[PDB]
Ligand binder design. Sequence first.
Ligand SMILES: Cc1cn([C@H]2C[C@H](O)[C@@H](COP(=O)(O)OP(=O)(O)O)O2)c(=O)[nH]c1=O
Ligand SMILES: Cc1cn([C@H]2C[C@H](O)[C@@H](COP(=O)(O)OP(=O)(O)O)O2)c(=O)[nH]c1=O
Lengths: 375, 373
Amino acid sequence: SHMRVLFTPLPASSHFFNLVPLAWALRAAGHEVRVAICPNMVSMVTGAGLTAVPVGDELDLISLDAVEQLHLVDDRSLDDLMGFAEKWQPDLVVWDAMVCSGPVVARALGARHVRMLVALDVSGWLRSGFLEYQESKPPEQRVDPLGTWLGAKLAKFGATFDEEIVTGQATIDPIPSWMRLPVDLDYISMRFVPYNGPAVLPEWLRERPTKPRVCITRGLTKRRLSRVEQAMVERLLRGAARLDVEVIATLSDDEVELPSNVRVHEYVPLNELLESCSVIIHHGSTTTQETATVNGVPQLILPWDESRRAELLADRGAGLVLDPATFTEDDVRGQLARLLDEPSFAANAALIRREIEESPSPHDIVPRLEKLVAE
Amino acid sequence: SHMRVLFTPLPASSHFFNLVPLAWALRAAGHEVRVAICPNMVSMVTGAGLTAVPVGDELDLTDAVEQLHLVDDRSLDDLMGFAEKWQPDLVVWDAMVCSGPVVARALGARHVRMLVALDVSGWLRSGFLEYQESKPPEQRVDPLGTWLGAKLAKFGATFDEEIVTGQATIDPIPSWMRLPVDLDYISMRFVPYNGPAVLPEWLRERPTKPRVCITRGLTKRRLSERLLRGAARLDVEVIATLSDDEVREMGELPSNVRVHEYVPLNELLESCSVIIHHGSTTTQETATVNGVPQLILPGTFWDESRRAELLADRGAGLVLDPATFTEDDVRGQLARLLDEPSFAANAALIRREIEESPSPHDIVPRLEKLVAE
Ligand SMILES: Cc1cn([C@H]2C[C@H](O)[C@@H](COP(=O)(O)OP(=O)(O)O)O2)c(=O)[nH]c1=O
Ligand SMILES: Cc1cn([C@H]2C[C@H](O)[C@@H](COP(=O)(O)OP(=O)(O)O)O2)c(=O)[nH]c1=O
């Protein structure tokens, strides 16, 4: 192997999935890749065929001092990682934009670090707002709580603060260029490649449909909590079925009696499904969204700023939006009917898809990173 | 570009793992990748992060040789059915299956055969291809060509030599081990995928004495023969820590034998000074790219011998005559690998060479081009 690469993803499937392909792209180049993950999400990682370094105490990131844990930057955890990291000596850490964990270790270690977005650059945009204001102030008042508080963890390992710890040496952007918030950083445009958990293709998913297909999903991380109202889905699902189509609703144990043209599963490999859908209806989250977008499928979204990206997608003519408060089954139907009927969306979605499939693939990104490590 | 690519592995762990990196290589490149697999084993596919496509009936390794080569009706028909539909551009096939290339020919998709052993099929085949040429036209029987040709019939298809060897063969075996055979060989850098891998605590702490790693295969582990006891029992005889394999009982292990059911092979090998293995390929190769001097007690049921013999030629291993190796052989040899900086000095040279080979990553634009030729 040339490079030893460490990933520090947030401990939740969507945030993790969004790392998988690049992880492998790298692997396929011949670099060693490890994924650092709290020891209860271990088999998530192993599941994507990647090697998992359990680190810290268990964490039910969903159910969630307490502020520290969420971003993997608390004492208990960081130390373990740092402990391995120290021993392991990666040349590069690629880190989910919501954990501080990995850049702390990176600076402590001197290894290049790269932030990867699973959403619009709020952190960086905001952070940008700030740096500029703080700018004009009386130098003695140039406060920076985020920075200093970090410098303290940082100092724990003989490291000092840098702007870099907040936004990384680079930020890899998988949401499409046009959608990307204006904020003057070094952005690396990567084509989103879908990984949707473990994918098995059952027989029924092998034939062309015979009525136009509709997908109705909310990925895991949302819905799933629940676990310990509700109403909107049965609304969406009722409204949807009013139209002469097969609705695949991807649901957990919960209800209810359903329309005849509606079939329900706990998990179906979405990407695969979406090759055969005519319209997707989803809840604005991001891995779900691009799998849709990346598959040319027109969209019906019920909303990061899940609104904003869904608004942005609306705008460019590949989808529409309802308001989760004021929405009635009618709007569901009528909206769906538009998406399925006026072929602009079908079209507008394809142009966006063609666009997407010409941004650099993960595979295309690898050398751009080796390049970065050689500097 | 944007290909639709289907893999068709022999359904064994070794075999499938050997394909994973290329599989991912391509998905990473934004290609759709699909793995045709007997129902009972789809977990292994999903386990590696690739999309399983369940095909045929169960299979445990419709007359047998046909099932064992993925070429029975149940499989073939399934594989076709789906293939017809998904209409792949490229089919990559486990050199020991016939299902891929058939379905491939049938829909006129470029296919490519992928190797796991050396190339005994090709060696043997082309030998026959040479000999038959030197016979009169009325006598040049191709028993294999007929046998394939027929199946092909089913689907509107003719036989072509390419069904036997692919339109090109991807060789992950270090090219100096390569049997002399005139084919379109694509050299590929072995990239170990070993199954599911998690870092155990023990493996965090730096080794305090040489780490020897003994693996039965894996996986197989058939039967379920204790040349393995005599294996372990005469390494203990030197001051080394031994990481093992299995949950088999043979009375009292010595104290320096740290047994663990499953280890992650790649990872493990990073602290190891030596490895004793059965001579199989992911094992050999995982070990080779790790620069680890090997002791091979090979045999057996394929090219394990020749390759163990070839590695040995380049002074990076030593070999043990199974069934005739004494306990004191397994030390006196072990000891040679640990005491002679030649064996690592080589195990490095070879490795280094392999890293100069192109990666799965590097092999994409070529298959890309193959498909658009
Ligand atoms: C429910 C469900 C989810 N998924 C996958 C698709 C996505 O990759 C992932 C969810 O992504 P996302 O919508 O980003 O999840 P969340 O908003 O809850 O974090 O789960 C399926 O593939 N099939 C399914 O049926
Ligand atoms: C026992 C064991 C096997 N393995 C895996 C890694 C290799 O890819 C595979 C070895 O299979 P291989 O060498 O191909 O032999 P066989 O053909 O008998 O299966 O087993 C581990 O990763 N760790 C382990 O502890």
